[PDB]
């Protein structure tokens, strides 16, 4: 979908 | 000469393709991407 942010990537994968 | 103009749509497409190649979905699901890598942090502001 929409282009992700590199700051949100670590939030997602930290889960 | 590799030519990239100032148009926003083409730059958005290039950014999306680069993000797909550098951060593929399959590596994200398998928790195989390191967000602290320099070449990943650089992608934030390349072709804005």
């Amino acid at each position: 979908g929409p282009l992700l942010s590199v700051f949100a990537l670590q939030e997602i994968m930290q889960k | 000469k590799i030519v990239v103009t100032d148009d926003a749509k083409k730059r958005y497409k290039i950014r999306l393709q680069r993000f797909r190649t550098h951060v593929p979905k399959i590596k994200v699901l398998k928790k195989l991407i390191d967000p602290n890598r320099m070449t990943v942090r650089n992608l934030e502001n390349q072709f804005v």
Partner: protein, 50 residues
């Protein structure tokens, strides 16, 4: 609702990528439906002072 130019945040909030802070973390957020409703509430309160 209109949005500002992304280059404003590109050249100021994420000018150095080696560090992260509150604003840099928050620039990656996307609102849900209730948060957009809260935005409409804020604007409605702005257009009726007092």
């Amino acid at each position: 609702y209109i949005a500002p130019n992304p280059r404003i945040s590109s050249i100021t909030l994420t000018q150095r990528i080696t560090t992260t802070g509150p604003f840099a973390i928050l620039t990656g957020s996307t609102p849900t439906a209730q948060q957009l409703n809260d935005v409409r509430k804020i604007y409605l309160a702005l257009m009726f002072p007092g």
